[PDB]
Amino acid sequence: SQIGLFSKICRVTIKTLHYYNKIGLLVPAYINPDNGYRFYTSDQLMKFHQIASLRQLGFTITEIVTLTQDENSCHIIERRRLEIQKQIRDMADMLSRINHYLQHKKKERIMLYQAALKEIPECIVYSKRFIVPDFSSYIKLIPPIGQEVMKANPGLTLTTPAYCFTLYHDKEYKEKNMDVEFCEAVNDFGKNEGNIIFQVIPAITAVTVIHKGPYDSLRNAYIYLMQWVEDNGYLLTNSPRESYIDGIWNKQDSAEWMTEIQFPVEKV
Amino acid sequence: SQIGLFSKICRVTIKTLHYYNKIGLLVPAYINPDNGYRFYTSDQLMKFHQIASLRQLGFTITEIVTLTQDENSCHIIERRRLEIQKQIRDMADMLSRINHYLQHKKKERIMLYQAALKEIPECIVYSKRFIVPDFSSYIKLIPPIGQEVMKANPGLTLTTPAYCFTLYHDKEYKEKNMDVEFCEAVNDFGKNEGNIIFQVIPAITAVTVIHKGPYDSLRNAYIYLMQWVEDNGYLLTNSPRESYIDGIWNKQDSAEWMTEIQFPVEKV
DNA sequence: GACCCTCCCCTAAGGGGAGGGTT
DNA sequence: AACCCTCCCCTTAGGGGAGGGTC
Ligand code: 118
Ligand code: 118
C-alpha cells in the first residue's frame, strides 16, 4: 500500500508519515530502492493506532519513541500525569484570572491596575520598624534614617537594582498609628546601629501592581490587590510590601511617581 | 537604565527584551545610534508589567500587541476565555485517560489494547440487517451478500480504503439472537432489491481498539472498550461497529488477522 | 491524471552561541 | 573582563510549496 492509501486508512497527512519515517517512529515495511516509494502494511496500521493513542494523551514525539520501544518504561507516564495535573491547576488559575479581568473591565471602562505574579528573591536589607502618625510624616522621616545608616556604615553599598521598600505589619486598615517597617536592600550584612537593624527578608512569590501617581491614592491599588487576592482564591501570606521605584528623589513631577505594591501571596 | 540593569529590574532575560524590541512589543526609550545600546525608562517598566500581566493569562504575543495598542478589545479576552475552557476540558480528558492507562499498565505488564479517539466520516453502504443464530455462523453468510450485491448492481465499486464493518444493534448482551447488520462502504448508490438496502451511516466520533488475532477473543476488546467508556466518562451514543481490516480473505494465519472495534461515543 | 520523492522555508517565544565593539 | 550589539541556527509536530520523477 502506497503512502496515499495508508494515509487514507489512518486518516492522517502524508507529511505526518514522512516526518515519522524521518524520526524513526513508524518506519515503513518496504522502501522501494529505485524511486524511494514508501509501502505500508497493516502491521504498520496497528503501530500507528498506538502512536495516535499516545499522541492523544499529550505525549511528545520523543516520549513516544521511548514508550513504544522501551516497553517497560512506566515513569514516563506518571511524569506526564503530574505534568497534566500541573497544567490543569494552572489553567483553572488562568480562567479565574480572566474572569476577574472581564468583571473589572465590565465594571470600569479602563484597566487602571493590572495584577501580575512575580518572584521576589531574598535580600539583605537594613530595617527600621517603628510607629508613624500618618504616611506623610513617614515620608519625611525616611531620608534622615537612611543618612544615619549610610554615614555610620563605611563600605555599605546599596544593591543594583535598588530594591527599597516598606512593610505594613498591621492586620486591619489603620489610617493612623501605622506599624510600618522601612527597609532598603544592601549587598551584605552591616553592623546594627541603635534602633535600625539588619535582617534578611525572605524570598516570596507575590502579586504585584505598579501605581503611577501621587502617594495619597495608593488606597486604590491596595483595594484592587485585596479584591484580586480574595477573588482569585489566593491567600495573603505576609505583610504587604510597597516598593518605591520612582519618586521625589528621581523626578520632580508628582504625576510620574512610580511605586509598586507587592502582596506576598500563596494559593489555597 | 541600560539593558542589563533593566533585565534585572524586570527579572527577565536579555534575549526577551531583544525579541520584544524586534517585534515592537516593548521598544526602548532611547537607542544609542552608533553602538546600538538600548536604554530603558520607568515608563518601559510600567509597560513590561502590562506585558507580563497579560502573558500570565496565556495571551499570545500578537494578542498582547493588539490588547496594549488597541483599546476596547474585550472580544479577544472572551476568545481567550473560551479557549481556556476548551483546553481545561481537553486537559481533564487527558488526565482521565492517563489515569486509566496507568490503572491498566501498572496492573498488567503488556498492553493488549490501546484506545484512540478518532472521527469516522460519513459513508454510503449496502447493508443487510438480519438475526444471526451464532457469531460462528455469521462469518459464513457474508460472501453470499458480497456476490449478490455485485451481481445485482453491476459496476458498483467499493470505496478505497475498504470500510467493511458490522453494526451490533443489540443494546444488551446475547450469544444466539444477535440483531446485527453487515455494512460495507461503497462509492455510489444502487438498487435495494431484497433485504439488502442502501443507506448512509452518519459520521461518528468513536473510541477504537485494534484487535489482532482470531475472532473468538473479540469479547475482550469489547469489554475493554466498555470499561474505557465507563472510566473516562463517555457515553455510548450508537451501536458499536466492528471493522475487518484483515481476515481469511488476505491471510491464512489466524493470528495475523486484524480488526478494529469502534464505539460511537460523545463526551457527556 | 494521479501520485510520490527530496529539499527548502515556516511556525511561537525566545535560547544559545559566534564574532565584533567599547571602555 | 564586563556589558553591549547583530547574525545565524535551534527548539514542536508537521504544513506548504517547488522542482523533478514515477505508475
Ligand atoms: C536611604 C534611605 C532612603 C532613601 Sb530614598 C530612594 C533612593 C533610591 C531608590 C529608592 C529610594 C531618597 C529621598 C530623597 C532624596 C534622595 C533619596 C526614599 C524616599 C521616599 C520613600 C522611600 C525611599 C535613600 C537612601
Ligand atoms: C463484498 C462483501 C464482503 C466482502 Sb470480504 C471477502 C473478500 C474476499 C474473499 C472472502 C471474503 C468479508 C468481510 C467480513 C466477513 C466475511 C467476508 C472483505 C472485507 C474487508 C476488506 C476486504 C475484503 C467482499 C465483498
Author numbering:
A (entry chain H), B (entry chain G): 2 to 269
Describing publication, verbatim:
Bacterial RNA polymerase (RNAP) holoenzyme initiates transcription by recognizing the conserved –35 and –10 promoter elements that are optimally separated by a 17-bp spacer. Here we report one crystal structure of a multidrug-sensing MerR family regulator EcmrR and nine cryo-electron microscopy structures that capture the EcmrR-dependent transcription process from promoter opening to initial transcription to RNA elongation. These structures reveal that EcmrR is a dual ligand-binding factor that reshapes the suboptimal 19-bp spacer DNA to enable optimal promoter recognition, sustains promoter remodeling to stabilize initial transcribing complexes, and finally dissociates from the promoter to reverse DNA remodeling and facilitate the transition to elongation.
The spacer DNA conformation in EcmrR-RPo is highly similar to those observed in the structures of BmrR-TAC and CueR-TAC, reflecting a shared DNA remodeling mechanism by MerR family regulators. EcmrR-promoter binding is mediated by both base-specific hydrogen bonds and backbone interactions. K16 from α2 and Y38 from the β1–β2 loop insert into the major and minor grooves, respectively, and make base-specific hydrogen bonds. Backbone phosphate interactions are mainly contributed by H19, Y21, R39, R56 and several mainchain nitrogen atoms. The density likely corresponds to the tetracyclic sterol head of CHAPSO, which is routinely used in cryo-EM sample preparation of bacterial RNAP complexes to alleviate preferred orientation problems.
